[PDB]
Design a binder for this molecule. Structure first.
Ligand code: NDG
Ligand code: CL
Ligand code: CL
Ligand code: CL
Ligand code: CL
Ligand code: NA
Length: 129
């Protein structure tokens, strides 16, 4: 599923991401835009052979099991394919674990490089929440 901007903002707000660990909703929408272009089916392979999955590009090196990243962890205790669903619940629940692990949203490279220190409220402007 390719979400609309405001559609995803509302879905994330319903799942508890607004101000989660102090990150306002626009941070999460901005990260999704630049990680996946709002597409739940996005996948990208990393140099080390791990793969990033879903709307927030969660990495199999640490967070999910895809059966082909030897020696990796599965800290969200999910198959990576669950992160590709049109229902964002599994991605949101896993993201809550990631952002709580001490490094905040810096775990998302696109957030650090393209959202951090910008007017992220712009990503939710005009949306009915
Ligand atoms: C939280 C998470 O899994 N972030 C991943 C990061 O590990 C990976 O290096 C990057 C590659 O583009 O995509 C995402 O930012
Ligand atoms: Cl915001
Ligand atoms: Cl594996
Ligand atoms: Cl959903
Ligand atoms: Cl933080
Ligand atoms: Na893994």
């Amino acid at each position: 599923k390719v979400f609309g901007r405001c559609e995803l903002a509302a879905a994330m707000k319903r799942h508890g991401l607004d101000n989660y660990r102090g990150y306002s909703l626009g941070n999460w929408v901005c990260a999704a835009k630049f990680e996946s272009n709002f597409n739940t089916q996005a996948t990208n392979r990393n140099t080390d052979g791990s793969t990033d999955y879903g709307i927030l590009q969660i990495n199999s090196r640490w967070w999910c099991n895809d059966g082909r990243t030897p020696g990796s962890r599965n800290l969200c205790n999910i198959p990576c394919s669950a992160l590709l669903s049109s229902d964002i619940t599994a991605s949101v629940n896993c993201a809550k674990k990631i952002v709580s692990d001490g490094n905040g949203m810096n775990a998302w490279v696109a957030w650090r490089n393209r959202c951090k220190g910008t007017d992220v409220q712009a990503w939710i402007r005009g949306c009915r929440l």
